[PDB]
Amino acid sequence: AAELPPLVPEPGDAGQPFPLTPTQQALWVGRAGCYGYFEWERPELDLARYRRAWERLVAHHPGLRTVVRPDGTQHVLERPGPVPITVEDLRQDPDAVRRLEESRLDPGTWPMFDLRVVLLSGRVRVQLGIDLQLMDASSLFLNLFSDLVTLYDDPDAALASQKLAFRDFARWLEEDVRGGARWRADWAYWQERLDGLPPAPDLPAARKFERCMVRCPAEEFALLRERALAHGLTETELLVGAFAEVLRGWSSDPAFTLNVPVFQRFDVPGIEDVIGDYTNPILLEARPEGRTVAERIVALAARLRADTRHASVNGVEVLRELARRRGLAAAAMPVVVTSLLGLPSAARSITEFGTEVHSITQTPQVSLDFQIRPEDGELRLVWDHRSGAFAPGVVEGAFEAFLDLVGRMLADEPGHGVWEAPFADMRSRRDRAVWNETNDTAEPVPAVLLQERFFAQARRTPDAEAVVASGLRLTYDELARHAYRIGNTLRERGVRPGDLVGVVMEKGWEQYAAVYGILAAGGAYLPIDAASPRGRVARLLESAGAGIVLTQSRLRDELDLPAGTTVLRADTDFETASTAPLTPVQGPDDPAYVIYTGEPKGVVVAHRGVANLVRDVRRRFAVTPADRLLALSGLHFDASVYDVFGPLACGATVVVPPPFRRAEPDVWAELVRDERVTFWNSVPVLLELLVGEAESRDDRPLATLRLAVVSGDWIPLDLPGRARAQAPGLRVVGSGGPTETICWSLFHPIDAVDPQWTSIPYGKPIANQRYYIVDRDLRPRPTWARGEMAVASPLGLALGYLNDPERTAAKFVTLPGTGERAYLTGDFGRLLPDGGIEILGREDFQGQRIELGEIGVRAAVADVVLREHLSAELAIRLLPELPLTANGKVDRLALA
């Protein structure tokens, strides 16, 4: 070690100033609330006897007489006044319980505290206010309350000799001890860590103090200690370590720092009788070190003791140097564990004086304060948390978790049970009920093929308008026939079961026949865009191993393809064919399509899953054959798979639009007006453009819309209402999911946009899908907790990535929870308390921008669409229009 200078007690300079301690100084600058409070009920109080005791206390303890000179220093007083106790009298008052309800200071003015007595009929309520600057947690419980009990019992009773008054101790640490033997070798320890220190726990926010607590009885207190010992741990070390596990539950990162203050008086003779601020924040580093709870708790506990062996540097100095190194705001420690365990047994317990009825330490720059403190043989576990520091339920839920962790520790002999269990599930009972309830989406998908359902309908209603395309219409029978024509032809050219027939073409009726024939032939269509570069279209086909290519006659020659790949037009090269039905040869778990998306990978998608989506949307939004869908997404965009297999499988009418490149909302408002369209499906920016052009027209062109499904990007906050403007009765619905999740994998009826939402929600999960939110260990999190979205399903997930079975084996994992095969979407979100998911973006944590902007795009790893208004209500680069991507959406990569 390195011995510390002796304390030099000079009882003469008591009045003359001494400087503020570091803990206290940091408070005396935050004021420009902060004041603890207690309240004990007792049957009958003797104010006379009471008042004397409080005069004695003030007489005796110079700390109850110290004031803060406005110069920043503090001096004792000697003739302070008389103690101001304030009696309120509410005994014959009915609604005494009302006037008593309404309840709740300066170091320049003398009483740093606040005495009160309220006289209800038959019982009395002593109310002690007190200031967080005037003394500390241990001075309060071991000196102030211990003597207030003695002094109330006998105001004249014997009181200890006040050797070496606190002004020296402060003048000692500030001058004599700071700088020397131990302190130099301890400022090394922290300076050699302030770069490895993780930030404070990052819990969920929701963009006064409240209190959960429990009383561990004597019999359970003993066991709690025995359990901590069996691991070579002190109760405070077991509980810090449990509290550390519970926090990782919600924490937005597993490594964080806990302000764990020690109340060390440095073994000084007589000091354990002087009232003052012995507070030293230790910055404990919580990194998870260990495979089990014991292993991690034991490990962290060690780093706490090393952080303790080097205490003579006051944390307020570490906290200040941490702000030097980093930001200031990136250095607060608003999660603290305040343990009074292992201090000396105080003469008297405040419980003797009266039973508590209230108390709330209103610390400043503290959102959560876990207080471990013993009272009359019991351990009082207490969580004072600044209300609204945390999203709803987060703290109340973590307390449930914590109580259960501790619960198990008392239940589980060490080395068994929870102690050697790799993690603990922190999701509360509600967390789980609501998640199961919400994700009980299991429904048999009958093994009917996709084409065999459309055929089935064309024989059911053959006069029906199947496709309507470029004026040139198409009945179900005619489209069924031409598919057969195409189906049979291909199978004759040997399109064996499972082969991939590219459908390289531009928006036309010929696409609906090309797909439904490739399926009947026994294959699986590979859409590629007929607007990609001349070298890309052939590149995707060679990489996928696709021979036959169905195409339109126009721009057949504009297709530099090899000879080993046959090419048929589909508006002509097919008409002398057999309109006689093909017999399905493929199974329902075989591929219906391969849609393509740093290198580009291709998504194999089976029949069953598409079959599942289709017959849910239809049951979700009664899809009658009356409905007429404007099939606007491209066939190489995942968004199309409903337009292909949705309406036709039940009797409705696809309504192809005029091929486009730049979004042409003039034409669409027309085609929607003309063909009486009732079903809109596309990315939100296109259904916005369409609402733009529709609002600026005397007619009601979009008025036949009964249903609009925006998905695939950010559905803007105003958009559900601007559309719901035109055509009252339109029901809006937003969606999404990766192209690896078969078009739409979850739905959120947008009936009513909350103003204070950063984003529209994402959804509840559709049929046969489950949306988990997992930590980095693929474990479900509790509500509000930030995670990656793992979409679990046997029939709702893509089969895999076309050829590469590594990016498949990596992104389609087996969740350790349950065995469910699930897709790691690489999108981050958090569960909501109605069961929904909020979508936070994807690897965007360096993100709520349009949060500020709308109340205009986001930043980048800023762009709006006019003053120097940075932080307007808290590099901007305005732009006329924001740049769309290929399919719509908002091209965040092009922006920087």
Ligand X SMILES: C[C@](N)(CO)C(=O)OP(=O)(O)OC[C@H]1O[C@@H](n2cnc3c(N)ncnc32)[C@H](O)[C@@H]1O
Specify the stretch interacting with ligand X by CB under 6 A; choose among 9-17, 109-117, 555-563, 708-716: 708-716
- CA 200, CA 192: separation in Å to the nearest integer? 19
753 contact, one of Cl ion, ligand X, none, CB 5-8 Å limit per kind? Cl ion
- CA 531, CA 625: separation in Å to the nearest integer? 33
711 contact, one of Cl ion, ligand X, none, CB 5-8 Å limit per kind? ligand X
Side-chain half-sphere exposure of 220, counting CA atoms within 13 A: 16
Nearest to 714 by CA among 747, 744, 736, 695: 736
Contact status: 712 vs ligand X (CB under 6 A): yes
Pick the binder of ligand X from 76, 242, 313, 639 (CB under 6 A): 639
Question: Does 698 carry a binding-site annotation?
Answer: no
Contact status: 600 vs ligand X (CB under 6 A): no
Shortest distance, CB of residue 843 to ligand X, whole angstroms? 10
The contact mask relative to ligand X for 827-866 (x = CB under 6 A, - = no) is x-----------x--x------------------------
Question: Does 735 carry a binding-site annotation?
Answer: yes
596 contact, one of ligand X, Cl ion, none, CB 5-8 Å limit per kind? none
Contact status: 657 vs ligand X (CB under 6 A): no
Question: Does 696 carry a binding-site annotation?
Answer: no
Beta strands per DSSP E along 20-129: 37-42, 67-68, 73-75, 87-90, 114-120, 123-129
Contact status: 309 vs Cl ion (CB under 5 A): yes
Contact status: 566 vs Cl ion (CB under 5 A): no
Specify the stretch interacting with Cl ion by CB under 5 A; choose among 300-308, 342-350, 457-465, 605-613: 300-308
Question: Does 103 carry a binding-site annotation?
Answer: no
Pick the binder of Cl ion from 179, 269, 377, 721 (CB under 5 A): 721
Site size toward ligand X, by CB under 6 A: 18
Contact status: 103 vs Cl ion (CB under 5 A): no
Q: Do 368 and 385 form a contact (C-beta atoms < 8 A)? A: yes
**Residue 415 DSSP symbol:** T
- CA 603, CA 683: separation in Å to the nearest integer? 20
Pick the binder of Cl ion from 49, 215, 305, 429 (CB under 5 A): 305
Nearer Cβ to ligand X, position 208 or 776?
A: 776
Residue with tokens 């590629």: 528
Q: What would the two tokens of residue 111 be?
A: 């009483």
For 286, list phi and psi in degrees, rounded to 5: -95, 90
Residue with tokens 């000879």: 563
CA 423: distance to chain centroid?
19
Contact status: 738 vs ligand X (CB under 6 A): yes
Helix locations, 497-651, DSSP H: 509-520, 536-544, 607-620, 641-645
Shortest distance, CB of residue 633 to ligand X, whole angstroms? 8
Nearer Cβ to ligand X, position 582 or 685?
A: 685
CA end-to-end span of the chain: 55
Q: Residue 838 pairs with which residues in a beta bridge?
A: 830
143 contact, one of Cl ion, ligand X, none, CB 5-8 Å limit per kind? none
- CA 643, CA 172: separation in Å to the nearest integer? 80
- CA 636, CA 204: separation in Å to the nearest integer? 38
Please report, as residue ranges, which positions from 752 to 791 form the binding site for ligand X (by CB under 6 A).
Answer: none
- CA 661, CA 123: separation in Å to the nearest integer? 82
Question: Does 713 carry a binding-site annotation?
Answer: yes
839 contact, one of Cl ion, ligand X, none, CB 5-8 Å limit per kind? ligand X
- CA 700, CA 726: separation in Å to the nearest integer? 7
Contact status: 597 vs ligand X (CB under 6 A): yes
The contact mask relative to Cl ion for 378-397 (x = CB under 5 A, - = no) is ---------x----------
Contact status: 306 vs Cl ion (CB under 5 A): yes
- CA 160, CA 478: separation in Å to the nearest integer? 105
- CA 135, CA 278: separation in Å to the nearest integer? 8
Q: Do 623 and 613 form a contact (C-beta atoms < 8 A)? A: no
Specify the stretch interacting with ligand X by CB under 6 A; choose among 5-13, 400-408, 461-469, 821-829: 821-829
- Which residues are annotated binding-site positions for AMP? 712-713, 735, 739, 827
**Which residues of the chain form contacts with Cl ion (CB under 5 A)?**
305-306, 309, 387, 721, 753, 885-887
**Which residues of the chain form contacts with ligand X (CB under 6 A)?**
597, 638-639, 711-714, 736-739, 743-744, 825-827, 839, 842
- Which residues are annotated binding-site positions? 712-713, 735, 739, 827
